[PDB]
Coordinates of C-alpha atoms in Angstrom, one line a residue:
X6 CA -42.4 61.9 74.6
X7 CA -39.3 63.1 72.8
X8 CA -40.6 62.2 69.3
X9 CA -42.2 65.2 67.6
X10 CA -40.2 67.7 69.7
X11 CA -38.9 70.8 67.9
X12 CA -35.1 71.0 67.8
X13 CA -32.1 72.3 65.8
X14 CA -28.6 71.2 65.0
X15 CA -27.4 74.3 66.9
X16 CA -27.3 72.2 70.0
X17 CA -29.3 74.7 72.0
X18 CA -32.5 72.7 71.5
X19 CA -31.4 69.0 71.3
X20 CA -33.4 66.0 72.6
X21 CA -34.1 64.0 75.8
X22 CA -31.5 61.3 76.7
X23 CA -31.8 58.5 74.2
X24 CA -33.5 60.5 71.5
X25 CA -31.6 62.6 69.0
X26 CA -32.3 65.8 67.1
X27 CA -33.1 65.0 63.5
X28 CA -32.6 67.8 61.0
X29 CA -35.8 68.7 59.0
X30 CA -34.1 71.5 57.1
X31 CA -30.9 73.5 57.1
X32 CA -30.5 73.5 60.8
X33 CA -34.1 73.1 62.3
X34 CA -35.4 69.6 62.9
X35 CA -37.4 67.4 65.3
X36 CA -36.7 64.9 68.0
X37 CA -36.8 61.3 67.0

């Protein structure tokens, strides 16, 4: 259930193992 998760390139809020934080803006993004 990583997909849809809120995240940011900052690295503070990445994603679950296997999934990656995809940028939706300048730094903010979502897990995919």
